[PDB]
Design a protein around this ligand. Sequence first.
Ligand SMILES: [Cl-]
Ligand SMILES: [Cl-]
Ligand SMILES: [K+]
Ligand SMILES: [Mg+2]
Ligand SMILES: [Mg+2]
Ligand SMILES: [Mg+2]
Ligand SMILES: [Mg+2]
Ligand SMILES: [Mg+2]
Ligand SMILES: [Mg+2]
Ligand SMILES: [Mg+2]
Ligand SMILES: [Mg+2]
Ligand SMILES: [Mg+2]
Ligand SMILES: [Mg+2]
Ligand SMILES: [Mg+2]
Ligand SMILES: [Mg+2]
Ligand SMILES: [Mg+2]
Ligand SMILES: [Mg+2]
Ligand SMILES: [Mg+2]
Ligand SMILES: [Mg+2]
Ligand SMILES: [Mg+2]
Ligand SMILES: [Mg+2]
Ligand SMILES: [Mg+2]
Ligand SMILES: [Mg+2]
Ligand SMILES: [Mg+2]
Ligand SMILES: [Mg+2]
Ligand SMILES: [Mg+2]
Ligand SMILES: [Mg+2]
Ligand code: NA
Ligand code: NA
Ligand code: NA
Ligand code: NA
Ligand code: NA
Ligand code: NA
Ligand code: NA
Ligand code: NA
Ligand code: NA
Ligand code: NA
Ligand code: NA
Ligand code: NA
Ligand code: NA
Ligand code: NA
Ligand code: NA
Ligand code: NA
Ligand code: NA
Ligand SMILES: [Sr+2]
Ligand SMILES: [Sr+2]
Ligand SMILES: [Sr+2]
Ligand SMILES: [Sr+2]
Ligand SMILES: [Sr+2]
Ligand SMILES: [Sr+2]
Ligand SMILES: [Sr+2]
Ligand SMILES: [Sr+2]
Ligand SMILES: [Sr+2]
Ligand SMILES: [Sr+2]
Ligand SMILES: [Sr+2]
Ligand SMILES: [Sr+2]
Ligand SMILES: [Sr+2]
Ligand SMILES: [Sr+2]
Ligand SMILES: [Sr+2]
Ligand SMILES: [Sr+2]
Ligand SMILES: [Sr+2]
Ligand SMILES: [Sr+2]
Ligand SMILES: [Sr+2]
Ligand SMILES: [Sr+2]
Ligand SMILES: [Sr+2]
Ligand SMILES: [Sr+2]
Ligand SMILES: [Sr+2]
Ligand SMILES: [Sr+2]
Ligand SMILES: [Sr+2]
Ligand SMILES: [Sr+2]
Ligand SMILES: [Sr+2]
Ligand SMILES: [Sr+2]
Ligand SMILES: [Sr+2]
Ligand SMILES: [Sr+2]
Ligand SMILES: [Sr+2]
Ligand SMILES: [Sr+2]
Ligand SMILES: [Sr+2]
Ligand SMILES: [Sr+2]
Ligand SMILES: [Sr+2]
Ligand SMILES: [Sr+2]
Ligand SMILES: [Sr+2]
Ligand SMILES: [Sr+2]
Lengths: 132, 53, 337
Amino acid sequence: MEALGADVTQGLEKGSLITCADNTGARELKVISVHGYSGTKNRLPKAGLGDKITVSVTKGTPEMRRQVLEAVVVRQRKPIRRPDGTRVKFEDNAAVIVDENEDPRGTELKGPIAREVAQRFGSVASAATMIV
Amino acid sequence: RECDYCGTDIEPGTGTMFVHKDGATTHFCSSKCENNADLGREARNLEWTDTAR
Amino acid sequence: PQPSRPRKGSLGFGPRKRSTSETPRFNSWPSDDGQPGVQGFAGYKAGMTHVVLVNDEPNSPREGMEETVPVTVIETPPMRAVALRAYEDTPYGQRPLTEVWTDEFHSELDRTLDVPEDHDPDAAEEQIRDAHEAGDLGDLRLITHTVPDAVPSVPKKKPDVMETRVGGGSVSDRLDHALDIVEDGGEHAMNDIFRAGEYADVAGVTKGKGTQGPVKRWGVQKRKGKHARQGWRRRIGNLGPWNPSRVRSTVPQQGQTGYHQRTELNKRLIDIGEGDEPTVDGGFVNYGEVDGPYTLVKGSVPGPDKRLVRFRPAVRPNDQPRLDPEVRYVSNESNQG
RNA sequence: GUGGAAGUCUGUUAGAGUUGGUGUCCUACAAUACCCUCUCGUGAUCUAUGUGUAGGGGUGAAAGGCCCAUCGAGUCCGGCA
RNA sequence: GCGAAAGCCAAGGCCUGUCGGGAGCAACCAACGUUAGGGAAUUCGGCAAGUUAGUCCCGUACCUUCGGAAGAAGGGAUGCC
RNA sequence: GGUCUUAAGGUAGCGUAGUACCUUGCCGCAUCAGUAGCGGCUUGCAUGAAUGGAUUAACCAGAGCUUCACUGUCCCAACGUUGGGCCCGGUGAACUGUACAUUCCAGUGCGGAGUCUGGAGACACCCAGGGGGAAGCGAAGACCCUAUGGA
RNA sequence: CGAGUGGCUUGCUACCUCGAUGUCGGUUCCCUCCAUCCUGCCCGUGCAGAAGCGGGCAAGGGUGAGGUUGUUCGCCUAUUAAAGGAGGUCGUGAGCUGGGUUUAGACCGUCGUGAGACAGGUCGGCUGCUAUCUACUGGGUGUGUAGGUGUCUGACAAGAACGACCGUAUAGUACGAGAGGAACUACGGUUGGUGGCCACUGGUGUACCGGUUGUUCGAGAGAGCACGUGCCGGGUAGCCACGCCACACGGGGUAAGAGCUGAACGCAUCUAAGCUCGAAACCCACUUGGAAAAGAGACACCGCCGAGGUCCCGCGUACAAGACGCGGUCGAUAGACUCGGGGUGUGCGCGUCGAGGUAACGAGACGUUAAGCCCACGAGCACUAACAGACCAA
Ligand SMILES: [Cl-]
Ligand SMILES: [Cl-]
Ligand SMILES: [K+]
Ligand SMILES: [Mg+2]
Ligand SMILES: [Mg+2]
Ligand SMILES: [Mg+2]
Ligand SMILES: [Mg+2]
Ligand SMILES: [Mg+2]
Ligand SMILES: [Mg+2]
Ligand SMILES: [Mg+2]
Ligand SMILES: [Mg+2]
Ligand SMILES: [Mg+2]
Ligand SMILES: [Mg+2]
Ligand SMILES: [Mg+2]
Ligand SMILES: [Mg+2]
Ligand SMILES: [Mg+2]
Ligand SMILES: [Mg+2]
Ligand SMILES: [Mg+2]
Ligand SMILES: [Mg+2]
Ligand SMILES: [Mg+2]
Ligand SMILES: [Mg+2]
Ligand SMILES: [Mg+2]
Ligand SMILES: [Mg+2]
Ligand SMILES: [Mg+2]
Ligand SMILES: [Mg+2]
Ligand SMILES: [Mg+2]
Ligand SMILES: [Mg+2]
Ligand code: NA
Ligand code: NA
Ligand code: NA
Ligand code: NA
Ligand code: NA
Ligand code: NA
Ligand code: NA
Ligand code: NA
Ligand code: NA
Ligand code: NA
Ligand code: NA
Ligand code: NA
Ligand code: NA
Ligand code: NA
Ligand code: NA
Ligand code: NA
Ligand code: NA
Ligand SMILES: [Sr+2]
Ligand SMILES: [Sr+2]
Ligand SMILES: [Sr+2]
Ligand SMILES: [Sr+2]
Ligand SMILES: [Sr+2]
Ligand SMILES: [Sr+2]
Ligand SMILES: [Sr+2]
Ligand SMILES: [Sr+2]
Ligand SMILES: [Sr+2]
Ligand SMILES: [Sr+2]
Ligand SMILES: [Sr+2]
Ligand SMILES: [Sr+2]
Ligand SMILES: [Sr+2]
Ligand SMILES: [Sr+2]
Ligand SMILES: [Sr+2]
Ligand SMILES: [Sr+2]
Ligand SMILES: [Sr+2]
Ligand SMILES: [Sr+2]
Ligand SMILES: [Sr+2]
Ligand SMILES: [Sr+2]
Ligand SMILES: [Sr+2]
Ligand SMILES: [Sr+2]
Ligand SMILES: [Sr+2]
Ligand SMILES: [Sr+2]
Ligand SMILES: [Sr+2]
Ligand SMILES: [Sr+2]
Ligand SMILES: [Sr+2]
Ligand SMILES: [Sr+2]
Ligand SMILES: [Sr+2]
Ligand SMILES: [Sr+2]
Ligand SMILES: [Sr+2]
Ligand SMILES: [Sr+2]
Ligand SMILES: [Sr+2]
Ligand SMILES: [Sr+2]
Ligand SMILES: [Sr+2]
Ligand SMILES: [Sr+2]
Ligand SMILES: [Sr+2]
Ligand SMILES: [Sr+2]
């Protein structure tokens, strides 16, 4: 993928439960897989800011619940490093449901998003109210 | 840049920025400051702080 | 089904024993191209700090922007190319033929060698030039030594001696180039060889850690879960199969870790200066203060502070040189904190 | 409200026991030990001393358990080389 | 302090749960403290470890042999002067 | 089959059971995915009434499953603490020992060799280590068969 | 239908072992095989493209995470370039596990008059040893080559030291009616592996500073104990990874394959001689070890009455012993002291205030006080200690 523009210490693994920062009807998401990733023996697959991930809806509306969808990690608690050396970290771990074209499935995003994620997924960005 | 907590200047190529739930942003110069903040202490009440001083 | 997995650690840096010479010994040299010139220099590791640099890379989306870069500060005072050794080609490889020494020696070079009192530089030169006419001359190298005395932070006064190849134009030209240096007194500097922005290969003897176990030394797993409480925590599963009935040298075992020679490729030279601009407040921890000839190497360098490190023009650079990077800031903040 | 029952509850009170660690030990401190966890603790309870039941016999809320480190028939000597 | 509980301390006893000296004292093992982010993905199995915790107030489901379930759950309080 | 053996021919219930071989039975629940678990179905290889059936509040260091909480169980390991370990003084055993023995790769051989054959390698001695091999040490195999053996 | 190869399945035999060679599955760690799943390079196509399908060379590297089940196998899920198979006593219990198998307790179904059985199911159920030799990982002492110092050579040896993917430009281009939709090449990044380093972020930090519970020292001050910190907060050095840095291009020779010239065979023919090309594979390039390489190495200088070395002393860039490195007055090597640089968070005492209370008394607040206390770092400084001195040596 296009360079992110910052160094990331993946703060998530397969099975992690995260916030769904949008208005799709999904409240909690469980990480199932990480797009383009391949690990090593015994290593739990990891994902962090900017990665596209396959997810399962854990909490939310009946219609959304249990559906296996694609998403994009927009926030994480583990720090990331920007070109100028500063570390950046969020209050929680969150992702946004996305379609086969990487367009957000929802209409509105909830909470801030890392500028770096915005650069990668523009249509996702053109939904953000706060970009940090 | 200045530390949003103690007030001293943040040595360039250092520190961390905490992005609050509402989108607010707090630039911390060090763990020490971050940790006192997590305890609920307000910089003005801590004598060693520039803010306080 | 027993998943695959690469082995633990590389088999290319063995045997993993204590290094014979604390002074690094390059086992390869740059190719001959430019004008004649010494292909290496040396210095003493001081510590690290960071610098803000203007992105240099013309292919970077950030070209022309602020970029914080880690830097290891190395004190690189002037050295003395004290002699010119010539190698002759033979059926059994290269062999030392003769050496052309000088008269002027640093006051303390006698702490390591028995300095020459009677020597014939022209007889030596004569034999060499005849070897060239004969077409039996192998490369040309200079016997070089450091001047620890110029470095206050380093306790040693005894100079460190190393041989450094001279490459360049035609042999005749660099042979003369070599003789030129030596004669003077051999005194040369980092400038004479490197320019900020070029890539160098740094060699050095790593930090010693004495005996360490398989986990730390080879990176093998610790026993897991229940297997970690029965009496074995940091021991590998087994030393090998029933057959072959012997332990192969490839199985990860305990032993000396650290204090090995390592040659790290393509280290970018961020800046070559002199004075105390890089020094840190309070002084570099376990080292002291810098105020003299110095070199800033991008990133890390093998070895502990005070160890002799060697530089050589990169023999396999991946990128083209982007000379004299613009440094907008050099942190002098205390390293204690 | 009083009353204070209970093969009643909690409890490393005394005292009794022993689920798991498959921990420690395994030429041991110990031919059954050590530590933590765990169970019982007013009753078919626990405990001392005295006393009785003896080997195809005892004793057994029964596991072929126990009857002096040994029991699908004790130990000793004899039959016996 | 509810207490014959813990913890600390007297009276009294002891330094004999009887080999010492040395190395910032390495690997490795026993027993243990602290670990970012993720949070059972580990494993036959949460085995091991941990979480909870004392007291008061509010409040407490299915089911029931009407005894119980029940400290269900869940919520709040707690020092000093 | 619409009686026959041998007296009767399984009723109430329960049911793929700690009993169901087939079997991961089929449907559903739950999970991203559930040979598990629970509910239903049930022709039950080979359930069933004191050889007790069914059911069941309370109880349980009894077996299985799920959830919330939590966590170094794990991703993936790190640093630290105490006692050992290491060096020194003193004390001071045991196991084990046909012989020789610095081995390695192949082969051969009663077909699973440090010792035979052919090569390869190999200067002697010592310290620490984790245990690949000596079909390592410990116990005249408990499994199986045999004995005109025992209990 | 016919001919074979393997020794992964199963069967057969009874050759070895019953004075014992401990089971399945898993785990951990190492080596290998190719009948190739991916990656490289090719050939064909019912090959427009994209992509399939089939075939060839090729073992360098990779082949992962999860749900049921003890399972192997297998079924299933989301990822992936792909999530290949097999050998090593079905590698691996003097390494681990103990779920399964496989003692002694117990239950069910079936069988048996019964004791009891079952190649059925089920709950519970024990894993000894101080390594002699050999093997290997690291560390020493000697001898040999044959006075000393410094620098090298390179026979040999090890490596995967690098493998793979995504994205952008090429390009909505070639191709195609359209739908759809490449490549060469140049770039940016990710992942797995590898080696190193701590300025940054993160962990630790039983140095240290602070808060505070119980108890004891009468109170105060200052302390002990509460397990090797009572508990809680912060955290220097150092060590670390979750942090940071670095890990080619290009040559040479080939395989499959594409061809040139070319005869046997006037022609033709990539082949028979000759030649041009051509794989992640082979060799080199790069890193690491390496004078014990018995042809036991090379150079330079110093010395044989003295070069060098040992003991000794102060110390660590080193370290389990040993080894290694530095300094020793021609000196800053260690400590003291003073600055600097750091940690914590505002000391004792006194003064004011303080809900109240006749008063006594009084938790606590402010000031003095960027205070006090502390530091495994740096600098300065010969104040103390590196003294005195013994010895070997061609
Ligand atoms: Cl995955
Ligand atoms: Cl393990
Ligand atoms: K046998
Ligand atoms: Mg695994
Ligand atoms: Mg620091
Ligand atoms: Mg800092
Ligand atoms: Mg009695
Ligand atoms: Mg944690
Ligand atoms: Mg698993
Ligand atoms: Mg438990
Ligand atoms: Mg069922
Ligand atoms: Mg009846
Ligand atoms: Mg026998
Ligand atoms: Mg038998
Ligand atoms: Mg009999
Ligand atoms: Mg036989
Ligand atoms: Mg054996
Ligand atoms: Mg083939
Ligand atoms: Mg095609
Ligand atoms: Mg291979
Ligand atoms: Mg096996
Ligand atoms: Mg074994
Ligand atoms: Mg065993
Ligand atoms: Mg043992
Ligand atoms: Mg079981
Ligand atoms: Mg019985
Ligand atoms: Mg069982
Ligand atoms: Na053990
Ligand atoms: Na074995
Ligand atoms: Na009453
Ligand atoms: Na027990
Ligand atoms: Na009898
Ligand atoms: Na004594
Ligand atoms: Na019946
Ligand atoms: Na009971
Ligand atoms: Na731990
Ligand atoms: Na062994
Ligand atoms: Na391969
Ligand atoms: Na599975
Ligand atoms: Na075996
Ligand atoms: Na095994
Ligand atoms: Na075992
Ligand atoms: Na096993
Ligand atoms: Na080639
Ligand atoms: Sr050298
Ligand atoms: Sr070399
Ligand atoms: Sr065990
Ligand atoms: Sr063998
Ligand atoms: Sr009771
Ligand atoms: Sr009780
Ligand atoms: Sr047990
Ligand atoms: Sr325990
Ligand atoms: Sr025992
Ligand atoms: Sr009572
Ligand atoms: Sr007995
Ligand atoms: Sr007799
Ligand atoms: Sr007393
Ligand atoms: Sr004594
Ligand atoms: Sr701490
Ligand atoms: Sr689990
Ligand atoms: Sr699981
Ligand atoms: Sr509560
Ligand atoms: Sr019926
Ligand atoms: Sr019943
Ligand atoms: Sr032989
Ligand atoms: Sr040992
Ligand atoms: Sr035997
Ligand atoms: Sr082949
Ligand atoms: Sr392919
Ligand atoms: Sr098998
Ligand atoms: Sr199966
Ligand atoms: Sr295996
Ligand atoms: Sr079992
Ligand atoms: Sr059975
Ligand atoms: Sr079974
Ligand atoms: Sr000899
Ligand atoms: Sr493209
Ligand atoms: Sr289109
Ligand atoms: Sr204490
Ligand atoms: Sr507590
Ligand atoms: Sr060809
Ligand atoms: Sr030699």
